[PDB]
Design an enzyme around this catalytic site. Structure first.
Site, mmCIF file in Angstrom:
data_model
loop_
_atom_site.group_PDB
_atom_site.id
_atom_site.type_symbol
_atom_site.label_atom_id
_atom_site.label_comp_id
_atom_site.label_asym_id
_atom_site.label_seq_id
_atom_site.Cartn_x
_atom_site.Cartn_y
_atom_site.Cartn_z
ATOM 1 N N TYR A 117 27.181 93.863 19.917
ATOM 2 C CA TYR A 117 25.744 93.629 19.883
ATOM 3 C C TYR A 117 25.125 93.506 21.271
ATOM 4 C CZ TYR A 117 25.988 92.808 14.829
ATOM 5 O OH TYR A 117 26.169 92.951 13.472
ATOM 6 N N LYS B 196 39.206 90.042 13.040
ATOM 7 C CA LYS B 196 39.789 91.296 12.579
ATOM 8 C C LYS B 196 40.845 91.773 13.578
ATOM 9 C CE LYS B 196 40.156 94.920 9.909
ATOM 10 N NZ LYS B 196 40.905 94.847 8.633
ATOM 11 N N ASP C 94 37.916 90.599 6.815
ATOM 12 C CA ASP C 94 37.671 91.165 5.492
ATOM 13 C C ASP C 94 38.284 90.303 4.395
ATOM 14 O OD1 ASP C 94 40.269 91.692 6.184
ATOM 15 O OD2 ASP C 94 40.280 93.750 5.419
ATOM 16 N N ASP D 167 27.640 87.340 11.654
ATOM 17 C CA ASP D 167 26.444 87.878 11.016
ATOM 18 C C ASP D 167 26.720 88.253 9.566
ATOM 19 O OD1 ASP D 167 23.890 88.891 10.601
ATOM 20 O OD2 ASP D 167 24.390 90.856 11.440
#
Lengths: 418, 418
Positions: free
Chosen positions: A162, A232, A285, A309
């Site tokens: 971002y 992740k 996930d 987010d």
């Protein structure tokens, strides 16, 4: 400096920062507040009144907030020059006065910007994004047991994909990056090198440790049960994977975290309550599944920008609290609490929209100042009005046998329930 | 062209690919199938019979599959040399016979190939990851209305951060890419330049369009109401944002889509139904909310690798279908359908695990060959057995008044109710 537009309260005093970033909060602190554009005219007065009511019933006049109005957004340009969408004076006011709250802000037309909130983030180095999530009795929820969700997400907001370091596909900028990657770095694993847009994901040790250091200290300052590193990293070993490992270091180095029976998780005992905190990690996930199946097993969350987010938005929908999402952006000391929704120009001044977001983010503010008793009154007042089904239109649309209240009316309904 | 250890079916015929990307399916197709390691011995035979039952019950003898067994994984080491976990001959059978079905394969090892599945996807140019998701009557779910979920997620799996292009923090390579980025590219948006791990996010035009193309054609070949492009483009204009625009381009280009009600979304019409399809887009983090609040408004999803991964995991837990998730990896023509769970070593050969995953991924195979009736019979038999409360151990332990069945009997339970 820039003391020419801020009218400092006379009976007010300053919140101050000491070693460990602990906060000495006087009973008559000055809290800068930005009214916010659009429907900011509606929710901010209601907020001040609801907070004033909650502070007033918990301590009975001993404590009181000296509200000081600083300016930003479209109001600042009508108060400042038309070029000063974000006055330096406002920034000094938020820095000199640790705590502050703000409503939604308009985006300046065009320019190298798509948000004014990011301008505050960049310029004050706000790198933590706090977003508590819980269920309020009576809120329509899509899950069978929404009450099991009681989490606080600490989201890094200065790093990751971002940042905005990206180059358009088929652009000379991209080709210079792409070919440099394939020529000098031996970069393979790319499937299509032509007409390819590229982005960069930076994850440093400093930005990572100052997040987890904030997430861990909140776990002890509020006596929470566990801190989870969401990552992740099994596919990104050196960014998200590096985030996890760096996160585990902070717990071991600066909080006295030992390996729990051989890892991969750790645990330490709160130095000021004696309760057993836990430092674990979950794959991103997989986490999205866990919040649906076993959300009761998680408390504090430390994660990166993108993950936080997606995770916070999912939890919000899980408890039917999208429209009432509290939020805060923190630095080493500066703490700015905000409503997470837009400005809703079409309803500005019409006393319609839901002030729950700004009210609950104000509950964070009180919680952050140690005034937990006043904060609880805001929670009680929140559960009361919603359980009574006296709510603004956004909730009334989703309930049967509900009573439509205006923005100010809903605030008064809260005050009557605390 | 290989023919060493493989026995070509005598009564078999070959599926061919012709112009127009159409698939020629004869009356007796040859389907290669990998039995898979671990619990592959349990689910693959059960699958073969259930498909055989559906093909001949749907079509009264008109059609029948000539099962050909190719080898991969452990068994490929006993039939071939014990070093050839993946025979080249096996790949020839899957490329010449585009359709094929597959069992679970062992994954951990972190060599420059992180698994055997990646070796297949990389050596076969598998760039689509199909994962249909729906609810089956009686399955314990954490949401109030699981029946509203009926989606097909098209996930790109050749591009994005999952490519593996990353460099460790504090490494000369990292400083080399950094000092190249910060100096020659003028990158100033990075906050911490030291001890910083870097990753690259590539999203190309060809890789984007070949997903959305395969996603759009699935919408017309199966008459799904809409296709949604899930993207995080509001912050990543040149990667995820470029994926969005490219996806909308494909609609105009090869499906005849024109704007609706002032955009931004679009609509075209399948030549098979004439019913008005919709091509819309949703922001990724918002999408995670939508699937909980308004899942009934989404059908086919085309998205990127990371988003698709998070999205499929969320939906799976949402319908209690984690353990029975069908999946397929496709190329321009090569189509390999697989079980999505692990190998479950402890449970290997014991005839316990749930064959629903491999069975339902076989329903895709039939659906992909145009045998929509045989595919529907597998669905009808699935709802029946599950509604009938005749289930495997995994479901039996979470249900009240449930009947424990083994893997093979559960397959027979399907056939008895199709």
């Amino acid at each position: 400096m820039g003391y020419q537009k801020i009218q400092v309260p006379a009976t007010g005093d300053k919140i101050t920062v000491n070693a460990d970033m602990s906060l000495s909060v006087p009973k008559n602190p000055i809290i800068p507040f930005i009214e916010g554009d659009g429907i900011g005219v509606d929710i901010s007065p209601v907020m001040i009144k609801v907070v004033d009511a909650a502070v007033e019933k918990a301590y009975k006049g001993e404590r009181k907030i000296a509200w000081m109005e600083v300016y930003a957004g479209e109001k600042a340009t009508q108060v400042y020059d038309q070029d000063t969408w974000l006055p330096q004076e406002t920034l000094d006011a938020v820095r000199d006065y640790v705590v502050s709250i703000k409503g939604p802000l308009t985006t300046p037309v065009g320019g190298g910007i798509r948000s004014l909130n990011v301008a505050l983030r960049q310029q004050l180095d706000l790198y933590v994004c706090q977003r508590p999530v819980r269920w309020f009795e009576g809120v329509p929820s899509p899950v069978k047991k929404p009450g099991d969700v009681d989490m606080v997400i600490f989201r890094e907001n200065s790093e990751d994909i971002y940042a905005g370091v990206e180059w358009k596909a088929g652009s000379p900028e991209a080709e210079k990056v792409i070919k440099f990657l394939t020529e000098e770095m031996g970069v393979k694993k790319i499937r299509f090198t032509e007409n390819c847009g590229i982005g960069i994901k930076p994850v440093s040790q400093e930005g990572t440790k100052r997040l987890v250091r904030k997430a861990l200290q909140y776990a002890v300052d509020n006596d929470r049960s566990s801190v989870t590193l969401v990552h992740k990293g099994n596919i990104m070993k050196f960014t998200e994977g590096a985030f996890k490992d760096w996160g585990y270091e902070v717990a071991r180095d600066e909080f006295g975290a030992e390996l729990l029976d051989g890892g991969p998780w750790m645990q330490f005992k709160n130095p000021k309550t004696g309760k057993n905190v836990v430092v674990k990690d979950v794959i991103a996930d997989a986490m999205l599944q866990q919040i649906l199946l076993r959300p009761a097993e998680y408390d504090v969350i430390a994660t990166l920008n993108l993950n936080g987010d997606y995770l916070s938005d999912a939890l919000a929908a899980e408890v039917g609290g999208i429209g009432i999402a509290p939020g805060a952006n923190l630095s080493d000391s500066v703490a700015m609490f905000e409503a997470t929704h837009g400005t809703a120009p079409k309803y500005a001044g019409q006393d319609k929209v839901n002030p729950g977001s700004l009210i609950l983010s104000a509950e964070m503010m009180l919680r952050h100042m140690g005034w937990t008793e006043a904060a609880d009154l805001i929670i009680k007042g929140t559960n009361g009005a919603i359980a009574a089904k006296t709510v603004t239109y956004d909730f009334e649309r989703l309930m049967d046998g509900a009573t439509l209240l205006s923005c100010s009316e809903f605030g008064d309904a809260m005050i009557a329930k605390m």
